[model samples]
Target: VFLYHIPCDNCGSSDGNSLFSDGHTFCYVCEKWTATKERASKRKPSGGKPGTYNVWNFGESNGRYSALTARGISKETCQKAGYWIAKVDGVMYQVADYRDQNGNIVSQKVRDKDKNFKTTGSHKSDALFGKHLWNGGKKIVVTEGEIDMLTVMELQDCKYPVVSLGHGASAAKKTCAANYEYFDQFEQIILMFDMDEAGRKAVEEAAQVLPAGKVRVAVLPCKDANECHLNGHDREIMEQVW
Candidate 1:
């Protein structure tokens, strides 16, 4: 909440050297940052909770006994994405790795039948769900969940670049900064969330976080992207998003 700059407490250097908002000062000489109490609060994730779990990849899930097939995605497509499967407490879960722009798995997401979601890694390093499939396109689409990311791929025949928020739409700002380098390159960013109320709210919040001129919103006829896909939408997702 506080914004200003002062001498770096660590090195006591104030040559207009450099300073950050929130009462934090950085001394390039000492290579240290003196942060204030407000900066410490910013450390917590959006939900004020951390996810810690281990992801064991059992190879690519071929849509076998997984929701991928049920969501209208074929076995071949799921395998193409290199998605993995996991069974925990007698429930089948599809594990999607949140890969950073640099091709590192920063976190893991485990989703279940009822759409119950959980993560096994500290979200502190959270990144977009699927950027590895990007094809160096000028335009990209952002979805609210990981499955939607795949839905975009399947529907588009992997012709365009698409990505999803790490921990849902609320984590938009938290996760977007990590992928800024990748996002800033695109001339157009499409936001395709669900048709539900919560999904609408999320789109508004996420749009605020994204660059204004480059952002657009896609409105689906069904509840969400996967539902729209399963409901027999066309390759362009009804071609509704403008």
Candidate 2:
């Protein structure tokens, strides 16, 4: 379970890192992990030659879009967003595809049953998750996590285009700064990050990087979009947009 966001020694992002109940701390920006004294620290070694990483390397080729029962994500939403479940090492894993502006797969983030995250391909080339599905319009929703993005899309009946940050709250500014051109297409950029302190801080940081006057903050009753949906507050989100 998540304890709360904490300042990272590596990235120096206030609330950019998180401390889990297992006594391990992870920095979302620098991708550093600090393990407890009793447990051995395991870091996935960077593999593959330069420019040779493939999404299928970590996830299976037979992966299919399916309902994520734990996150309350439906099969239809999963398919629309190109998210799928793949069996890796005899364990089911959720695979999230990250694409570039041209709709080319740049990377894939795989989450296993142990909640361990591993990535195949370069993180630098990752565009906001789900950005390839829709063009810029009047408005767009930005989320911190892929599941939150799916939750928002499912709640909206897949009406508006929603995307997510490549990393956690700490990397929000970096991601926004790099992709300002893509965000510039929309008239209004709605930030729907988690409603915690880090989420609020990320909203402010991201808004500063985005086009001025085009950024709006989404106030949710719960901690994040997934929680809001799980608590049956989806209608409240619609009202906020209205």
Candidate 3:
């Protein structure tokens, strides 16, 4: 929830900035996050914080890069996304680093054998999962999960901008609201989420927050991008987007 609107230091616009409940302040006029006194302090906490973890030792050292054949993602794509297989508590898991807008590693999301997910550091804000990789372009694809993002990235030859939601479907509106300015840079914003009921609903909700007439919803052939690639429906993905 939004706390209140305040003056923007970056653009010097009075009453053009608002602070969200997450403790970040966004300037509407400049479309950037302002390092306000309170906001800057919130970004870096004192040592020994309860939830924070060292990124290097959070999982296995740098993890192991491998082909995720189950999802049809190649080894190169995994490396490009900084995604890898790691061992946490003696169990193998998939890990991905989440970074702040400045490209600093802020947290790590780990998915274990049972598909259980847990975060090693703070991830309260909802930025695009892979926003740091690519600059703004003519087209951008957003997916529901990390694997789906990587699958779409592989389909696009790993050149274009393909991102995923940091949180689940429920945070669709919040994520879009927090990062609407970034989404506005793309000429075409394609939302390629899962084909399930929740994903379908998230597409609608996120589209509402994005710039109008530019958002396009791409329906997958299977449950999601990864599944669609697994089932050999790769051609249909690009076809649906355009």
Best by lDDT: 2
Q: Across residues 1-242, which tens digit of lDDT does each residue of candidate 2 receive?
A: 46667788887888878876666788989889876422222322344457654667433465888898777789999888878888756678888888766867777777877887777767673358888877778888888899989988887778888998887788999899988989898898888888998889999899998899988888889988888888888877776653
lDDT of each: 0.68, 0.80, 0.79
Off by over 4 Å in 3: 1-49, 52-62
| lDDT of candidate 3 over 118-231, digit per residue (tens) | 776666556567888877888988888889889888887788888888887878888988888888789988888779998889998988888899888887778987788888
In model 1, state the lDDT of residue 157. Answer: 67
Each model's Cα RMSD: 9.5, 17.3, 10.4
Tell me the lDDT of model 1 at 5: 48
TM-score of 2: 0.74
Clashes counted in candidate 1 amount to 1
Q: Is candidate 1 or candidate 3 better by lDDT?
A: 3
Give the TM-score of each candidate: 0.69, 0.74, 0.76
With a 3 Å backbone cut-off (N, CA, C), the pairs that clash in candidate 3 are none
lDDT of 1 by residue, 140-213 (tens): 88888877878887777656777878778677765665666667778888888777788788777777767768
Write down the worst ten-residue block by lDDT for model 1.
42-51
List residue ranges in candidate 1 displaced over 4 A.
1-51, 59-67, 235-242
lDDT of 3 at 42: 54
